[PDB]
Design a protein around this ligand. Structure first.
Ligand SMILES: [Hg+2]
Ligand SMILES: [Hg+2]
Ligand SMILES: [Hg+2]
Ligand SMILES: [Hg+2]
Ligand SMILES: [Hg+2]
Ligand SMILES: [Hg+2]
Ligand SMILES: [Hg+2]
Ligand SMILES: [Hg+2]
Ligand SMILES: [Hg+2]
Ligand SMILES: [Hg+2]
Ligand SMILES: [Hg+2]
Ligand SMILES: [Hg+2]
Ligand SMILES: [Hg+2]
Ligand SMILES: [Hg+2]
Ligand SMILES: [Mn+2]
Ligand SMILES: [Mn+2]
Ligand SMILES: [Mn+2]
Ligand SMILES: [Mn+2]
Lengths: 340, 341
């Protein structure tokens, strides 16, 4: 029941962000929420080409690092690669089919496009610091500890996509599919979308920032400067991506968009809280693998754990959630040099 | 049965373009078909911003145009706007779920993204030539002649998407849903993808090019020059987009990628031909109506009809189809001035 060009002349300023009539005409002369048009303009103003970045000195620097530091650096980089591989396709496959205002539709496509640039930047780094990129990329798929840390991201998206297909194909109601009773509830699908957004918020707001701190620890040592320039550019894009999901979520919570979404945000509040607590614990658990062969001055499991707590509280407060962790000052204030 | 991250380590150089294992790692250090990596690189190198183009004199040119010429210009722009609105979302929603090699997956996202820039540029033009853009944007959805010229485009994508959902949800076989039999066949879904791609090839390679003739006819008269600069950049992008679908279609019909797709292509050779001819016919009908209130300087319904027949022959030959029209040389060689590429 999805269509690539809905034939009803509708007032796009009055549709909800999600689940209304699919967008027909892509126009940018007006917006229900100008924040998405501002985000598109800012992301386009940030356009960068990874291949232009000089990473010729990173190979010298990398091969010079002691073995445990190569492990820390590459294990981090493989996780960034996994996340952006998922973020390049998922907003388009999972969110695009449910969007009903043009400014949010184009924002999601722009945001997903910018993630493919990040992926292309990891290939640029990887091909220039190791002799066989294939060993690095293949490990991303099979590495148990990497998958463990990301557990639940692809699951969430996949479940939303499957429920969306049932909805678009069958409509609301209880159906009989190959003899099994299948319930399609729009309210349940709105909850699934809503929690998928909260999960994406945690992914960009927390998981990527923990990874940035690990990358910048090398830059503070005056090493892997090509990587650092790229991570700085990637972080600048991620700041916009998380601004986008924070606004989607806070707008839904306000009751100014779909009223049912404001009810759902309030009703599913413990689940929001729980998914942030679980993601933080996963980022902490990654330290055992990250520092398996030794830690570095200023970067070890304890510092990583303190920073996870610090940044999780900040991101949760930004979308209205209670704080799970003891408050603390930033354990790694040197990161502010790199996050500009 | 689709996943955003397939957990099976697979050799991405050996998957088919479509229907294989969904792409897990996005890497660009190797590819099965390097044409898609070359297209991504070229499209990224062509990045442009509509707001960077001065359209300040287009308002006065448009206003001084005779009424039938305003009608020609605006009707043509509304159709370009409809086509890129569809092209901004559709390659992503329709093709991404079926791609199994990374370079093609990123090419599609890059191609679709470049179309949103086109849509943004039409807003930049429209806002700068009319008092109230809403009059122009609302007429796109229900404009009778526009619907007639673009008739069928959304239905091909829509049917492909629907059949893809059934396939991912239920898999191949004879199923039942609420008392009715629903048959899912991978062969039929491959055929729907093949025809959808042939239609996208006609959209970008013939429908858009006919619209470019209209826009550049004004540029030749030194009018609507802001619009001209923007259509020039859009046409440079479209040359890449059609290069991408020509390669997808030729790799599918040659049999080098999926033997079954080669058998399918041969099997719908006649259908594909008649659809191409139908697209050409819709474009002629649009011209006939558009030049009803009066011809323009340097363009009329017959000249445009010849251009449609000329470009249709070239594009059909490029994807191995027989030529439907009498061969002729380009009836409007001046257009080459504007079609870099
Ligand atoms: Hg999600
Ligand atoms: Hg870290
Ligand atoms: Hg919440
Ligand atoms: Hg801690
Ligand atoms: Hg298609
Ligand atoms: Hg199509
Ligand atoms: Hg025309
Ligand atoms: Hg014209
Ligand atoms: Hg024309
Ligand atoms: Hg065909
Ligand atoms: Hg066929
Ligand atoms: Hg064919
Ligand atoms: Hg065709
Ligand atoms: Hg014709
Ligand atoms: Mn990213
Ligand atoms: Mn991001
Ligand atoms: Mn376009
Ligand atoms: Mn195009």
């Amino acid at each position: 029941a999805y269509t690539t060009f809905s034939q009803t002349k509708n007032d796009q300023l009055k549709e909800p962000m999600f689940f209304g009539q699919p967008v027909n005409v892509a126009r940018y002369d007006q917006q229900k929420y100008d924040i998405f048009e501002k985000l598109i303009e800012k992301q386009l103003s940030f356009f960068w080409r990874p291949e232009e970045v000089d990473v010729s000195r990173d190979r010298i620097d990398y091969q010079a690092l002691p073995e445990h530091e190569k492990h820390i650096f590459i294990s981090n980089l493989k996780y960034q690669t996994l996340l952006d591989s998922i973020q390049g396709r998922s907003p388009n496959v999972a969110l695009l089919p449910l969007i009903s205002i043009p400014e949010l539709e184009t924002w999601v496509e722009t945001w997903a496009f910018s993630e493919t640039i990040h992926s292309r930047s990891y290939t640029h780094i990887i091909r220039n610091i190791v002799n066989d990129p294939s060993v690095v990329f293949d490990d991303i798929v099979t590495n148990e500890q990497i998958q463990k840390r990301a557990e639940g991201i692809s699951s969430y998206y996949d479940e939303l996509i499957e429920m969306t297909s049932y909805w678009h194909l069958l409509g609301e109601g209880t159906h009989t599919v190959n003899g099994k009773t299948v319930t399609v509830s729009l309210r349940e699908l709105k909850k699934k979308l809503y929690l998928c957004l909260m999960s994406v918020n945690a992914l960009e707001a927390i998981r990527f920032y923990v990874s940035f701190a690990c990358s910048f620890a090398f830059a503070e040592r005056e090493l892997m400067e090509g990587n650092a320039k790229i991570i700085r550019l990637i972080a600048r894009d991620e700041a916009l991506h998380l601004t986008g999901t924070q606004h989607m979520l806070n707008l839904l919570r306000s009751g100014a968009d779909d009223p049912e979404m404001a009810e759902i945000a309030e009703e599913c509040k413990q689940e929001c809280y729980d998914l942030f607590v679980q993601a933080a614990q996963q980022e902490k658990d990654w330290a055992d693998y990250l520092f398996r062969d030794g830690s570095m001055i200023g970067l070890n499991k304890d510092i990583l754990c303190q920073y996870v707590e610090y940044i999780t509280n900040i991101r949760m407060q930004a979308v209205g959630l209670d704080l799970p962790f003891q408050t603390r000052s930033n354990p790694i204030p040197w990161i502010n040099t790199w996050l500009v």
